Design a protein around this ligand. Structure first.
Ligand SMILES: CC[N+](C)(CC)CCC[n+]1c(-c2ccccc2)c2cc(N)ccc2c2ccc(N)cc21
Ligand SMILES: CC[N+](C)(CC)CCC[n+]1c(-c2ccccc2)c2cc(N)ccc2c2ccc(N)cc21
Ligand SMILES: *[C@@H]1O[C@H](CO)[C@@H](O[C@@H]2O[C@H](CO)[C@@H](O)[C@H](O)[C@H]2NC(C)=O)[C@H](O)[C@H]1NC(C)=O
Ligand SMILES: *[C@@H]1O[C@H](CO)[C@@H](O[C@@H]2O[C@H](CO)[C@@H](O)[C@H](O)[C@H]2NC(C)=O)[C@H](O)[C@H]1NC(C)=O
Ligand SMILES: *[C@@H]1O[C@H](CO)[C@@H](O[C@@H]2O[C@H](CO)[C@@H](O)[C@H](O)[C@H]2NC(C)=O)[C@H](O)[C@H]1NC(C)=O
Ligand SMILES: *[C@@H]1O[C@H](CO)[C@@H](O[C@@H]2O[C@H](CO)[C@@H](O)[C@H](O)[C@H]2NC(C)=O)[C@H](O)[C@H]1NC(C)=O
Ligand SMILES: *[C@@H]1O[C@H](CO)[C@@H](O)[C@H](O)[C@H]1NC(C)=O
Ligand SMILES: *[C@@H]1O[C@H](CO)[C@@H](O)[C@H](O)[C@H]1NC(C)=O
Ligand SMILES: *[C@@H]1O[C@H](CO)[C@@H](O)[C@H](O)[C@H]1NC(C)=O
Ligand SMILES: *[C@@H]1O[C@H](CO)[C@@H](O)[C@H](O)[C@H]1NC(C)=O
Ligand SMILES: *[C@@H]1O[C@H](CO)[C@@H](O)[C@H](O)[C@H]1NC(C)=O
Ligand SMILES: *[C@@H]1O[C@H](CO)[C@@H](O)[C@H](O)[C@H]1NC(C)=O
Ligand SMILES: *[C@@H]1O[C@H](CO)[C@@H](O)[C@H](O)[C@H]1NC(C)=O
Ligand SMILES: *[C@@H]1O[C@H](CO)[C@@H](O)[C@H](O)[C@H]1NC(C)=O
Ligand SMILES: [Cl-]
Ligand SMILES: [Cl-]
Ligand SMILES: [Cl-]
Ligand SMILES: [Cl-]
Lengths: 527, 526
């Protein structure tokens, strides 16, 4: 029968017959205790033992979220929505093993995104039944406490220290370091890879000293800690704890007695509050995310990066072509799913204070002027393409580019990619192009299947990036093959080579958006 | 050779040039000397003279302050007057081809000097070559400049402002009533100036009074929409009162203020014009054009947009290093004897000297816009940046913006781009094609081979002479030859212009569109 003896107990999975083969999927193994009762809003502890054999054979609890229903019934909005009922006992992990059980297969651990408030491992696209078989590697998947339950930070106080959600991952990565050799995995060749908050969490694990021995390499897909939304300042994050307690009716006597009120009230009672906690919110506001807790993160991430106090390893970071367009349909004026969404001049201007509330009028006019240099004016699609690039470069494109530039300075091979392919089955309209988060379908090898109505060009592309994603994990270079493939050069600060991922042609280019990103580096900080 | 004018007879020289000869009349009076009572007032028309004027010598130059920054340097004193200074300076010079032509087209030169210096008597302004090779008539002028030519008390005819501009207008009116007897068509007259005549010719397109004195215009590195061209009537009246207390003359009425100012000797007025502006720029026009109500109905930018101007052909153009001539006159780190490599800080200090009143946030905006280098290693790059932020904002962008709005009313605008640096340029090489050195090639000085001008500088000067003259005659700059690029018109959409260099002249599109887009659409906010 199919059972593996953990250093922790016994768990069994299933047979998933894939592509005409088989994989071993142990899905929903706990790596910590149910964080309710006497232990929530705090870091997780190591789980003791179970005597009954654990049936780790169905998607465990998605951790509680504020479920997005701004457009009910639509696929693309309900696609990222958790596939499992919500609660606080949510600290499980999925792991798919290629069958037959391998010898020292390279391990990959996916960190889901969602802006440190949403997201869950149980989603259909975060799944590695493909990656496990096509390249014969082990794929691990985790669920961490998201929102105010894993990122409520009272600095120094153990009862709510901060970045507990990031500590869930550190414990989840510790489980794989303890007992994945029983599954057949190589605890020495372990690659992190995430997206939009996982890529941000992947980068934060390059900083945390407690994780310097728990993985080998990193892959950052449209995310990094130097993004303006990744880490919030300490005495602004500690504040949004006090206003939360002020919100739930808790008057202060000291700073410790208050936490016990935070615990008594209901789970969804407090997630109702993750929207009012920040008054000047914006569609890219992280109301409760990572911060400087002194234990997980010694200082602000930009300081440790500049001083070079991070894990010296090889990374694979890249962005998509139209990251910013996903955030315009959630509040920006004149932007809808069922339009073509043309805008005039100042709906871009007022489309700036929605994303830049605390910026001077000179700052917004500087943003407007720099993104107004038209190649063709009377082109009506100008201002909507401009606003998408404004949100895209400020939040994901440049933060990933300059991170690699600074990471490359310390002498480790880094590779950058630019995803320009729009999937045919993307349910959102065409004006949003290659949208944020819709490249992971290719990363997990979904087009590799013929029954999802994916065209042949996309599956050749999916098999291409799955091969290099896997090759980088085992070897350190995301090479395709030799004697028929386009070489992926290393990114370094002087030439800044990056690889394009599309169906037309995988090209080598230099200095991605160097003219645009210079604004957000050399001028906008001075505004 | 002797002739007769409408107010007497002049007696002119003869100039043996190019083997041929050309007749000159240097120092003809076109206005009564504005001395004593008549100073600060518009020029009064001249009277008959019983004598017969001998126009055989360059007349005196108007009272001005000498550029003594570099004593002994030919480059700084090339623009200093060669005649003795006096207020009796409203004279004009005419050059006429031999034999006397039938109806030769006339070209009137307006000298520059920031409305503070300059004269017709400079060697760079010698028209004896233009009249010989093209058989055209070139007429030079002398107009009052400085306080004695542009003192502005708006409304009061004792000092109404723009008298220097009226000195020009009276000199044009002299041409259309005398040049027919000289051998030229009065109704085919072309105006060409440089950097203050270019701004003056640009102003003659706006004044209804001068609509009848010329046919077409030629602007060289200057326009009325330049930021230094026209002073607002507010501050222009401060500079008048600032000049009063500097000369101990602050009194009740402006009748009494001009009385003492009219009684004080000229250099007591001249030596104090550097203090009328508290925030003095190397391009600070102490006393220039004003919105007086007589020459300019209102501010010039509103007349260009509304459309009450003389509709005709123009020929505008600038050079690629217009701004570097002003960097050695106050900008720190820049100097004439040194490769003027500056740091980033010396670039910011230079910005404060040329942009005193604008924001700090605005100074960082013009900084960041001009640091997208083609090559980051280039140490020269910060030096070249300051040279163009003051070249575009002052000369390049206003000139391009002038023809764009001028041509939009159905007129034929022709834009050039003088790229060649003269081999005889007495200033160092880091300044490139400097502001005001197109004039040597416009007047045809390199054609006399007794000077150290390369052959590549003659055929350039010889070219520029024909096109300038043909534009005066036929309305467009043709050059009669098969192998020479036909200069197309400048319009708002495609924006074609012709560069002028020694190797060959090619045409380009939308000169410095990226840089001026910052000065057109972003700088007026900061
Ligand atoms: C589009 C869904 N996603 C999970 C795809 C992988 C990416 C997360 C995007 N994403 C979403 C978001 C948008 C729509 C639906 C669900 C979540 C979001 C939603 C709210 N209220 C507040 C902040 C964010 C947010 C903040 C930072 C980053 N970096 C990404 C973010
Ligand atoms: C002398 C050379 N020039 C007449 C070219 C033919 C150009 C005049 C440049 N030029 C000069 C200047 C600079 C150095 C030496 C002499 C004059 C100048 C000097 C002072 N104090 C104040 C204003 C200006 C000025 C103002 C506006 C414009 N548009 C040009 C100007
Ligand atoms: C699979 O690979 C792992 C690691 O790649 C091997 O384990 C050890 O790897 C280290 C590298 O740091 C070597 O120094 C050791 O010599 C390796 N072990 C041995 C016994 O040689 C491992 O051997 C491979 N095979 C299995 C079954 O794990
Ligand atoms: C990509 O390049 C790596 C080298 O960086 C190749 O790695 C070698 O792979 C073979 C087995 O395929 C190993 O025996 C070698 O030890 C590897 N070399 C190393 C680790 O330096 C890799 O094969 C390349 N990818 C492909 C598809 O050929
Ligand atoms: C006309 O305006 C000028 C400036 O606009 C006045 O002169 C000076 O302005 C500077 C501006 O920084 C001040 O620092 C000085 O204090 C001003 N001068 C004096 C004497 O206070 C000028 O005063 C104005 N004209 C009149 C007649 O007052
Ligand atoms: C061409 O260059 C020569 C020097 O190489 C100049 O010669 C000088 O000319 C001046 C007249 O301006 C005389 O006073 C000097 O005595 C000459 N020097 C020598 C060494 O002969 C010549 O003048 C230049 N050409 C022109 C037209 O000025
Ligand atoms: C599961 O798959 C394995 C490998 O293909 C096979 O040997 C086994 O018979 C299958 N069924 C069970 C119940 O293990
Ligand atoms: C703290 O939160 C309160 C809530 O309104 C408010 O004073 C402000 O947003 C924060 N103050 C500081 C100093 O961060
Ligand atoms: C797009 O549809 C929205 C729906 O409310 C509307 O507000 C907007 O004006 C439309 N844009 C157009 C028609 O360009
Ligand atoms: C010189 O001027 C005289 C008039 O005095 C004229 O007759 C003659 O043609 C001119 N040119 C010469 C002599 O070459
Ligand atoms: C005026 O100059 C002319 C030039 O030949 C000559 O008659 C004489 O030098 C002057 N005439 C008188 C009357 O002084
Ligand atoms: C100006 O003031 C003086 C002061 O004595 C006076 O005599 C003169 O008549 C006044 N002029 C006018 C025009 O008001
Ligand atoms: C250039 O000359 C000026 C003249 O004072 C000087 O201040 C400046 O430092 C010089 N530049 C260099 C690099 O020496
Ligand atoms: C330039 O214009 C005139 C008048 O229209 C014409 O006679 C002459 O041939 C033209 N020159 C060229 C080169 O076309
Ligand atoms: Cl008035
Ligand atoms: Cl001015
Ligand atoms: Cl008064
Ligand atoms: Cl010849």
């Amino acid at each position: 029968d199919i059972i593996i003896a953990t250093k922790n107990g016994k768990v069994r999975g299933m047979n998933l017959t894939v592509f005409g083969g088989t994989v071993t999927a142990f899905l929903g193994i706990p790596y910590a205790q149910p964080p309710l009762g006497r232990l929530r809003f705090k870091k997780p502890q190591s789980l003791t033992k179970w005597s009954d054999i654990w049936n780790a054979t169905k998607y465990a609890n998605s951790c509680c979220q504020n479920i997005d229903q701004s457009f009910p019934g639509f696929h693309g909005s309900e696609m990222w929505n958790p596939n499992t009922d919500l609660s606080e006992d949510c600290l499980y992990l999925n792991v798919w093993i290629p069958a037959p059980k391998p010898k020292n297969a390279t391990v990959l651990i996916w960190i889901y995104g969602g802006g440190f408030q949403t997201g869950t491992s149980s989603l259909h696209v975060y799944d590695g039944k493909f990656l496990a078989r096509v390249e014969r590697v082990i794929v691990v998947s985790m669920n961490y406490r998201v929102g105010a339950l894993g990122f409520l930070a009272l600095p120094g106080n153990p009862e709510a220290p901060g970045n507990m959600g990031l500590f869930d991952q550190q414990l989840a990565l510790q489980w794989v370091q303890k007992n994945i050799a029983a599954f057949g995995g190589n605890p020495k060749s372990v690659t992190l890879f995430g997206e939009s908050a996982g890529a941000a969490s992947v980068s934060l694990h390059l900083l945390s000293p407690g994780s310097h021995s728990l993985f080998t390499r990193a892959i950052l897909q449209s995310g990094s800690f130097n993004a303006p939304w990744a880490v919030t300042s300490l005495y602004e994050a500690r504040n949004r704890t006090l206003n939360l307690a002020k919100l739930t009716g808790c008057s202060r006597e000291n700073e410790t007695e208050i936490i016990k009120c935070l615990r008594n009230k209901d789970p969804q009672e407090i997630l109702l509050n993750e929207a009012f906690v920040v008054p000047y919110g914006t569609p890219l506001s992280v109301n409760f995310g990572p911060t400087v807790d002194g234990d997980f993160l010694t200082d602000m991430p930009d300081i440790l990066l500049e001083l070079g106090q991070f894990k010296k390893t090889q990374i694979l970071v890249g962005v998509n072509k139209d990251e910013g367009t996903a955030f315009l349909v959630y509040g920006a004026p004149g932007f809808s799913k069922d339009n073509n969404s043309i805008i005039t001049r100042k709906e871009f201007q007022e489309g700036l204070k929605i994303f830049f509330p605390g910026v001077s009028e000179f700052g917004k006019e500087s943003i407007l002027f720099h993104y107004t240099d038209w190649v063709d004016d009377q082109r009506p699609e100008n201002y909507r393409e401009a606003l998408g690039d404004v949100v895209g470069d400020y939040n994901f494109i440049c933060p990933a580019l300059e991170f690699t530039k600074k990471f490359s300075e310390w002498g480790n091979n880094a590779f950058f990619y630019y995803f320009e392919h729009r999937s045919s089955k993307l349910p959102w309209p065409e004006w949003m192009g290659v949208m944020h988060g819709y490249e992971i379908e290719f990363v997990f090898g979904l087009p590799l299947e013929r029954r999802d109505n994916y065209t042949k060009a996309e599956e050749i592309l999916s098999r291409s990036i799955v091969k290099r994603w896997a090759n980088f994990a085992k070897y350190g270079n995301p090479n395709e093959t030799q004697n028929n493939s386009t070489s992926w050069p290393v990114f370094k600060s002087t030439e800044q080579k990056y690889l394009t991922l599309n169906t037309e042609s995988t090209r080598i280019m230099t200095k991605l958006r160097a003219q645009q990103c210079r604004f957000w580096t050399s001028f906008f900080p001075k505004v």
